[PDB]
Structure 1
Amino acid sequence: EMQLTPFLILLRKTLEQLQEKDTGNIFSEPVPLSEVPDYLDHIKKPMDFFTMKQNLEAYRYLNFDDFEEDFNLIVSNCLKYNAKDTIFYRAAVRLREQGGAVLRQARRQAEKM
């Protein structure tokens, strides 16, 4: 029960803040299926920040859970696919921690609407 425009503005800002935490840009675009040919054997639903931006602008995220679910997919897919001793796995841990904090403050802003 709120106005759509300010909510989408908030999600845009939040997505930018999450992208800033991914300093290696490992989650900016889909995992290249040509470069990782076995990726879909293990990962049911790929996700990345560019796809999230497209979903946001297609009005596919109408509540904070919609948005956070796709962020969580970025993280969980990376933890699932990559071995624990890799930069990629640790980058997902870091994003979960740092991006979680961004998400908690942003959800609080949405609740004020």
Structure 2
Amino acid sequence: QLTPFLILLRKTLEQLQEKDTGNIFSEPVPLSEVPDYLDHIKKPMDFFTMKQNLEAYRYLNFDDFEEDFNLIVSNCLKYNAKDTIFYRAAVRLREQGGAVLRQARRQAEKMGID
């Protein structure tokens, strides 16, 4: 059912955001400061946009939620040089966030996801 599922997503998103200790993924990459970003990145994503989507009922299953979180990480690895704070943060977030999503998926299974 939608109510318990959205509560699960909010908690999951909060935990993912807590893993981003440097607040690197909190808001969209500022395109005005990074004008070549869209030359490399097909679909930007960030935690604020995810929260907006969540509250606007755009995540009605777990896969769509996962897909957007995974974009946050994959975009960052793809765009940034390996020796940057950003790339290193994405490597860490993939591992830590991955554990969060594993646990959250198991919870979603216990509810009503297909």
Which consecutive unaligned segments of at least 5 residues does structure 1 have? none
Shift of 1:37: 1.3
Q: Deviation at 1:36? A: 1.0
- Runs of 4+ aligned structure 1 residues displaced above 6 Å come to none
Please give the root-mean-square deviation of Cα atoms over the aligned residues, in Å. 0.5
Q: Cα deviation per residue 1:16-64 (whole Å; 9 max; x = unaligned)?
A: 0000000110100000111111111110100000000011111111111
Q: Which runs of 5+ in 2 are unaligned?
A: none
Alpha-carbon separation, structure 1, partners of 2:37 and 2:21: 22
| Counterparts of 2:61 and 2:92, CA distance in 1 | 25
1:62 matched to which residue of 2?
Answer: 60
Distance 1:36 1:97 in 2: 26
Aligned-pair identity in percent equals 100
| Rounded Cα–Cα distance in structure 1 between residues aligned with 2:88 and 2:63 | 24
TM-score (norm 1): 0.96
